Design a protein around this nucleic acid. Structure first.
Lengths: 91, 81, 77, 92, 94, 99, 79, 94
DNA sequence: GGTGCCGAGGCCGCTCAATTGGTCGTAGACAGCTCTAGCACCGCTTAAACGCACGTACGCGCTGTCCCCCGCGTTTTAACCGCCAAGGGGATTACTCCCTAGTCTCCAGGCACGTG
DNA sequence: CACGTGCCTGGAGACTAGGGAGTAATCCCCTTGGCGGTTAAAACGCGGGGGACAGCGCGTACGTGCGTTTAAGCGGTGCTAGAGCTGTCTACGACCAATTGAGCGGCCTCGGCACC
């Protein structure tokens, strides 16, 4: 029934569409834009959480902490390029 | 009235920050220069923060204004909104 | 990891600076914490570039000229 | 308005024996919102540049190629493309 | 179609009547004014969206000017803007 | 008189600035005072920049303002330089510093 | 010829002199060509995606101006 | 005499505003580097001019910044270490 | 100091965008109330800053070298300018049709709570 | 933090209806390609002199450590400023239809300048 189940994703296509409408980035928003944005956010979040989980396993902690997120972001060179001007609280 | 509180950034605090940064030895004149640099950056951020608060006709500088001012300065901030 | 500036002196510094722009202001603790984390990150980055400059000049002690050069190169002035 | 449940869902499917802390959820949520905002602003800028007032799949495929460089811009494109293509298959 | 050539020439004649504006300088200042207008407008849009308001009034576009033009020039520009808004408002003499 | 530029005593066109604000799509609605304030601000900015560029042209014994004089005006002044630091002006050159 | 040699030695010496330098070492030119080529890559890879989005087979000055604006080095004389 | 000529060259080129890269080699270079991303492309002469006048400005800024860190090290000769340090500090790359 | 060209400047026609007038729906100004969260104060104490002695790692000045850039004259190259062909794609217009805003139900999934 | 449980507002499906732009054909601007002259710039070679670098010694200021001071952090305790929410009214800004003159382009004048 839901568009997320249609696209085989987990991020909410409806929520991404609502955020796109509320942000007022253009007068009309296409139908495929929320699906594509949800897919890209899926891939990015999956990669970031994979790296953070690798860091947590290295630090032998079962929980993920903003320090682990900072290590994950600043260890991978490409994600470092994307988020180089970012400072994370308690990191 | 609060006066001469720039000295609240103590010499050991700047030393700890420098050791975290990666230095090994610090010259004696670095502390005053660092206090000046911190004061300049803090003025730049706080002016935009209080501008944001004035825009919303608020009297308390919300963290959602400081994060916006920092985003304006080019140094974003995650963990507060 | 850990805050390196003491909380109360930094809060008093922030209040003293902000009293110039708009008197009888108020700060909520989240804002002061955000400012502290941002300033600590900024100073750590500045001292990273300062150590780079000091190593460049065949030196191991960071000196005021190193901080000035790092700020001039980074753009801020 | 948060991605906390979706963050936990995506974590449990990649690292079974892991959990996300509240601060981690907050920073992840802010990061995802900022990334979405950046992509949306680039898409809207492109749409205005081309003298069109719709953000279609084209204006987002050609915006992630501007934000994410060739490391994943040639891969997150591939992951994104299957998503819009799969919707067409289910409709028929 | 959309430019500011005649107004640039008018301002230059008002300030430095003896001089004249070149085509390249006209283009550079046209782009400069467009860029400054875009920056002020987008900062005022951010300010409007920050307080859950969907309008960009004189208050928003004054706070954006103060926020994006720090220093003496910002105060002078804000004074000029308030003077212009007041001059417009004095046409409420009806 | 008529119009809004002459009503506020602004050389810059209030209506054109209003149209630009509408076309840029920065917010759903644009208030009445926003174009007036923005036209005044931009008029003052261009007045300052043109005065500085004309002074640079006079100091160069030149009666025509080219982009080089605009870059001299932008960089020599200590404030416009802050506002337009990351801006490259075509055929603008650089100030003579010789270290 | 890699055609990067079009940015020849005197064409870097003149540009550096405009920079303000007084003496240039012999190994500066290879690093300078590398810097120039990576900057050109970073700008062209955006000024080409802009045309590809506009469904155009040519690169215009407006696309390059937008690409330069994205990297933070705005250009004013064009568009 | 080892000096002097460099000083006059600096004074002449800083006062001037022309383009210091030969037009045709840069045009060929930009075509070659662009042909990788999308084959059979055409460039407006204005686009190549914009790219040239952006690359020259960036290179001259980088050379001023590397001169700063060369004189800072009690030298007058710029070396690849200086360029690498300037690019590292500016945040462009390593 | 003398000269030709070319880009800017002033006058007129006009049209298209700005202005004027009226309407209406709603976004927002505005008043009132609440509670929450920020401010000011109390004392303990103990981590942390601070003052001093000190030896030593290290900055900095002097000196020598040898080398690697600089300036300059020469030859080669390829860029710059004028000119022609051309056709490939940029930009418009006419049309329609198909995508999307808006609205009405209808329902579930994801938000919050409780639990061992 | 995971596994029931209740629940409710936002997401989804069906419909309408309306215009955004996708497609096609056409005009033609201009960007690619080529050729020829000519000539300024670049590549090469060489001598020479400044300066990059390494080494050595002096003195000097800094990290370490110890005793001293101090004020930050904790934990209440109390007070109230105002952030935030709600209810209600109205000034305003989007929108349309009619009117008109301000700025743009064509065209004729004329000084600024790059040149010798």
């Amino acid at each position: 029934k839901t568009r997320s189940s249609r696209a085989g994703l987990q991020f909410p296509v409806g929520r991404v569409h609502r955020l796109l409408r509320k942000g007022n980035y253009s007068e009309r928003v296409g139908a495929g834009a929320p699906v594509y944005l949800a897919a890209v956010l899926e891939y990015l979040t999956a990669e970031i959480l994979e790296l953070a989980g690798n860091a947590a396993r290295d630090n032998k902690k079962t929980r993920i902490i903003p320090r682990h997120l900072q290590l994950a972001i600043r260890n991978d060179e490409e994600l470092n390029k994307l988020l180089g001007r970012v400072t994370i609280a308690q990191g | 009235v609060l006066r001469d509180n720039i000295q609240g950034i103590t010499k050991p605090a700047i030393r700890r920050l420098a050791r975290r940064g990666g230095v090994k030895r610090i010259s004696g004149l670095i502390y005053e220069e660092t206090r000046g640099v911190l004061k300049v950056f803090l003025e730049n951020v706080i002016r935009d923060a209080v501008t944001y608060t004035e825009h919303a006709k608020r009297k308390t500088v919300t963290a959602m204004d400081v994060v916006y001012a920092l985003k304006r300065q080019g140094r974003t901030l995650y963990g507060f909104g | 990891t850990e805050l390196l500036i003491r909380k109360l002196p930094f809060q008093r510094l922030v209040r003293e600076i902000a009293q110039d722009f708009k008197t009888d202001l108020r700060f909520q603790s989240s804002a002061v914490m955000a400012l502290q984390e941002a300033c600590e990150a900024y100073l750590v980055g500045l001292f990273e570039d300062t150590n780079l400059c000091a190593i460049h000049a065949k030196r191991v002690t960071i000196m005021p000229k190193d901080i000035q050069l790092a700020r001039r190169i980074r753009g801020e002035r | 308005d948060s991605f906390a449940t979706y963050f936990r869902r995506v974590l449990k499917q990649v690292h079974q024996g892991l959990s996300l802390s509240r601060e981690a959820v907050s920073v992840m949520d802010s990061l995802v919102h900022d990334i979405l905002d950046r992509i949306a602003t680039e898409a809207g800028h492109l749409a205005r540049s081309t003298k069109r007032q719709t953000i279609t799949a084209w204006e987002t495929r050609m915006a992630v190629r501007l934000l994410l460089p060739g490391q994943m811009g040639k891969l997150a494109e591939s992951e994104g493309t299957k998503a819009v293509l799969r919707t067409s298959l289910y409709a028929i």
